[PDB]
């Protein structure tokens with residue numbers, strides 16, 4: 001009826017896109033008369049391109065090629081990113097209208113309001129550049145040869161390098177158009193961190209963490225600082241800033257999570273109560289504990305291996321459903337039901353505990369039902385529940401689930417091997433594959449799949465290097481230097497050390513264990529296995545301090561390290577620090593066997609000249 | 610101690626209502642506690658609910 | 663010595679006892695001794711502002727865990743009922759506030775009772791009670807029970823109001839996602855909703871209708887199932903909380919859902 005008006009076309013394209021009509025919405029947009037006379041007749045022009053970019057924000061593009069079999073170098077890569085072309089045009093239009101109105105001198109309030117939108121536009125541009133979407137490679141050229149497609153693929157990395165250099169271009173105007181823009185500085189911090197200019201990274205993150213209040217995005221920078229400083233251990237000031245951060249806001253649980261995890265890594269865990277209880281006191285009395293707060297406390301107790309209390313706290317954290325922690329808390333609940341003890345899934349079960357394990361699986365499946373099918377990790381936790389079943393026929397089902405995970409990620413032995421050499425996108429499922437292989441009795445392919453997962457996280461390079469490095473920086477591997485909840489690579493290298501112990505080549509096992517220990521002091525299990533390694537070579541001296549650390553970490557809860565550390569001291573020659581250990585064992589576990597006759601009597605014999 | 614299996618209050622139920630879509634974002638208003646079978650006196654319970662803290 | 667102070671002021675006609683009682687009430691509020699305050703009020707015979715001050719902490723309890731808030735309203739109604747015996751607009755507003763948190767408990771536990779048909783009948787009764795309970799709380803249950811019985815129409819209205827609330831809030835929301843997903847994966851047409859006729863003029867009305875659509879006569883609603891009562895033969899009248907229910911459901915319950923009054927025998 002009235003095709004001049006485009007206000008209606010706006011919500012038309014919006015509704016079409018939101019209902020999944022993609023090509024239809026694109027054709028709706030490109031059909032606009034304004035798309036290639038008051039002041040406002042400028043701005044809505046650009047608006048359509050915005051919407052275009054939005055409906056093409058999630059759309060996977062490819063790198064354009066030439067039909068001869070080569071990449072079309074004369075065809076720009078961002079041409080494939082039609083949304084990037086869209087907002088390239090849009091930002092040019094916005095600066096052109098800025099120069100249009102720079103000589104108008106209208107009512108200044110609209111000038112002031114307009115003065116900030118281009119910042120949003122170019123920041124979204126930079127985000128699209130750094131978060132680019134090169135499509136998965138085609139298969140027709142795979143069905144041609146094994147060298148031509150390889151030589152053709154050698155331009156996609158050029159494409160991403162070009163795009164990120166464009167982003168590094170975008171940063172300056174991004175910050176320059178608005179300094180009050182918290183997101184602009186945040187993105188600038190992230191791209192600077194991707195480049196390597198650590199000085200600028202510190203500037204951006206510090207600026208964000210000052211002026212951003214009333215928003216949680218600060219935490220996204222905060223973790224960055226916590227990885228920025230602890231990348232090389234040169235700075236530990238983040239700690240201080242953290243409490244300073246926590247000085248301003250106590251209710252910022254999402255920062256408190258990284259606080260707890262970094263403290264866990266530094267081994268200074270129990271002091272976290274300083275920040276914790278005041279936050280607990282921050283909430284007014286007579287009110288239910290905040291679900292985030294409950295998740296925080298349960299996370300703490302899980303790091304303290306108080307899994308029975310952590311179960312309750314996490315179940316308190318789930319209420320009410322739909323909260324941002326609800327998926328997280330449910331995932332943690334399933335994890336701790338799967339791994340209640342320090343024994344994780346890839347241990348070997350050497351009657352009575354099998355039935356309790358089955359009951360755990362009942363609880364786990366019952367709780368896993370609550371997680372939506374749309375959630376990606378739901379099927380991974382399904383496969384992990386089937387792992388918990390430990391039925392050797394269910395291993396086939398488990399690997400089927402874990403190898404549908406890769407097909408989800410992309411969106412005979414040949415099928416699993418083609419799932420193998422694909423791009424490493426979902427490390428959780430890859431660890432699931434490794435467990436699948438190991439509990440199937442397979443160790444070579446388990447080593448291969450874990451090796452591919454490790455290669456994704458670049459802690460491969462030190463195994464052979466450290467031998468000749470010590471023969472003639474011991475850099476903490478940058479993968480582990482996160483302090484976020486992603487524990488997957490930690491368990492990955494724990495698994496790898498476990499395998500190496502099983503094959504008994506304890507050198508590189510102790511090596512990677514020392515690597516993660518340098519990364520993390522709270523990994524009590526690794527302390528235990530390192531001490532076991534030292535026992536295997538009878539080097540009780542280092543094992544003694546490691547087991548003391550492990551005893552502190554377990555909070556005296558075990559008798560096993562009782563006999564372990566007591567024997568370690570006793571064969572070490574100085575069990576005067578083992579007598580108190582033995583009595584400490586007897587104080588709670590008054591009937592731990594083999595104590596009263598083996599150790600302190602031999603200690604008295606050793607005390608005699 | 611025979612009340613640690615509280616999640617059963619949604620276990621055999623949600624199995625028929627969650628298997629399709631992600632409607633969990635809507636069920637925030639559901640109370641964790643159920644309703645029991647006893648007559649509550651007007652005044653005998655206020656002391657025990659205010660004596661928690 | 664507040665107990666001595668009030669007696670001293672009363673025996674010396676010190677009419678300023680209101681300020682003294684206000685100071686005592688504020689002091690007990692600061693010391694969070696609601697039990698002492700309500701005992702003082704019931705020994706002093708104060709009813710309406712006493713119930714109001716009880717409800718002041720009642721809503722503060724209600725905003726996180728309201729199973730005590732419904733009890734607070736119940737004994738507030740009991741206090742205003744005892745006001746009648748103490749004697750020898752607000753007459754029914756107190757009962758409205760008390761009954762405002764009646765329906766929600768059994769509306770939520772109807773899923774546990776597995777008879778999901780009455781869940782919608784309960785859920786569509788809190789529309790008039792949007793002031794006491796926020797509509798975002800109730801419309802979630804309304805849409806949920808509309809989905810669980812596979813009916814629509816009312817769910818469209820609930821989702822529309824919920825999404826308008828969300829758009830008011832943002833000026834990334836998942837209730838728009840739920841509304842669009844359900845409306846495109848299912849037919850969004852209202853099912854049969856007129857199944858009860860008016861006892862006066864014979865006009866078929868909604869099961870949740872508070873008044874007739876033709877003759878405009880209010881109907882007393884069932885206290886547990888929520889259906890409007892059309893015949894007084896199957897209507898059971900409670901003599902304590904002054905409420906009505908249906909015989910076929912109240913025979914199962916030995917006590918009233920509101921007051922739990924024991925049956926005299």
Ligand SMILES: [Zn+2]
Pocket residue numbers: 860861862863864865874875876877878879
């Ligand atoms: Zn009528």
Ligand SMILES: [Zn+2]
Pocket residue numbers: 900901902903904905918919920921922923
């Ligand atoms: Zn009654």
